[PDB]
């Protein structure tokens, strides 16, 4: 197993990453992101966007929904794939955009805590 990580946790929004290695292409890591909301109000029109360094390639698949419900009653699930031919240490910048408590929210953050198994 590749251990899971918390990629982001701020303002009542948590994003967890779980990982599997592809059996089709060993250079690919499939990341499943799970976004959860511990506050009292839904986070709507939720968009996750990632960016990885030049020697990596990224494919973002469709999310399960655009709402992170209040009280943690479910999650948004989105799969993203990373192609890492050179086996460089995986690292990523994420951008999170959503509405909460009436307001437009947006945050950019770095994810520099990937487990070695996710890229070696």
Resolution (angstroms) stands at 1.7
Q: Which residues of 54-93 are buried (b: 16+ CB within 10 A; e: fewer)?
A: eebeeeeeebeeebbbeeeeebbebbbebebeeeeebebe
Q: For position 110, which CATH number holds?
A: 2.60.40.1230
| Residue span of the structural domain in which 75 resides | 1-120
User: By what technique were these coordinates determined?
Assistant: X-ray
How many structural domains comprise the chain? Answer: 1
- Write out the chain in H/E/C secondary structure: CCCCEEEEEECCEEEEEEEEECCCCCCEEEEEEEEEECCCCCEEEEEEEEECCCCCEEEECCCCCCCECHHHCCCEEEEEEEECCCCCCCCEEEEEEEEECCEEEEEEEEECCCCHHHCC
Distance between CA 98 and CA 34 in Å, rounded? 15
């Amino acid at each position: 197993m590749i251990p899971s990580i918390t990629a982001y946790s701020k303002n009542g929004l948590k994003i967890e990453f779980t990982f599997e290695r592809s059996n089709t292409n060993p250079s690919v890591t499939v990341i499943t992101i799970q976004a959860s909301n511990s506050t009292e109000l839904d986070m709507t029109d939720f968009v996750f966007q990632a960016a990885v360094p030049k020697t990596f390639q990224l494919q973002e698949l469709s999310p399960s929904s655009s709402v992170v419900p209040a009280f943690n009653t479910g999650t948004i699930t989105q799969v993203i794939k990373v192609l890492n031919p050179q086996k460089q240490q995986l690292r990523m910048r994420i951008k999170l955009t959503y509405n909460h408590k009436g307001s437009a929210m947006q945050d950019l953050a770095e994810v520099n805590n990937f487990p070695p198994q996710s890229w070696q």
